[PDB]
Structures are given as structure tokens and as C-alpha cells.
Amino acid sequence: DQMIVHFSMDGDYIWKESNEYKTQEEIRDTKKALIKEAMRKQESEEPGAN
Amino acid sequence: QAIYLKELKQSIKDFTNQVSIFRRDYEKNGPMERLRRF
Fold first, then answer.
1. Which of B4, B6, B9 to mutate to test the interface with A (most CBs of A within 10 A)?
2. CB contact set of B12 (below 8 Å; sequence gap of 6+)
3. How far apart, in whole angstroms, are the C-alpha atoms of residue A17 and residue A45?
4. Fewest CB atoms within 10 Å of the CB: A1, A27, B20, B23?
5. Which chain B residue lies closest to A42 (C-alpha atoms)?
6. Who contacts B30 (Cβ-Cβ below 8 Å, separation ≥6)?
7. Calpha distance B9→A46 (Å, rounded)
8. Exposed (0-12), middle (13-18) or buried (19+): which is A42, by Cβ within 10 Å?
9. Rounded to an integer, what distance in angstroms lies between the CA atom of residue B31 and that of residue A47?
């Protein structure tokens, strides 16, 4: 490549409605759905689950 | 585990009842020879 970079920085910054942002939203929704199903099922199975 | 989850809700109710019974038994043991036995 023969190109020299004094400083290289990689960061977790995403802009609104990005393609990558949509994937992140799906991951949050999938985790939330599993959490929602688990909380609801335990709440449904038990009586007045707290 | 799905079958066990139905079993687990029933078991959790049974376990709470068992824990209350165990606490009552511990209190009886705590209640001389009687104080030592309690």
C-alpha cells in the first residue's frame, strides 16, 4: 500500500436513518421481544408476579 | 425446558408453600430442653 497514517481512529458514531442504524434497531427489538415474552410469560404463569 | 417451564410455574408455587412450611418448622424448633429443641 505504501501509504503512512500518523493517527488512525475508529469510532461508534452513526447518523440518523443509516443502514447500520436499522440493523442496530433490529438487534434492540429482538432482545426486547425476548425480554417482553419472558416478562409476560413469567407474569402470566405466576399470580400477581412482581 | 418448554414442558419444564409449565412444570416450573407449578413448582414455584409448590416451593413458596414449602418455604413457608420450613420457616414455620424453624420457628417451632426455636421455641430449657424446649428452648434448645425450638
1. B9
2. A45, A46
3. 39
4. A1
5. B9
6. B38
7. 6
8. middle
9. 33
What the block records as the C-alpha cell of B35 is 428452648
The resolution in Å comes to 30.3
Chain position carrying cell 412450611: B21
C-alpha–C-alpha distance, residues A32 and A24, integer Å: 12
Cα separation, B3 vs A43, in Å, equals 17
This structure was determined by: cryo-EM
**Cell 407474569 appears where?**
A43
Q: Which residues of A touch B (CB under 8 A)?
A: 41, 45-47
How does B25-34 read in b/e, with b if 16+ C-beta sit within 10 Å?
Answer: eeeeeeeeee
N- to C-terminal Cα distance for chain A? 61
DSSP state of A14: -
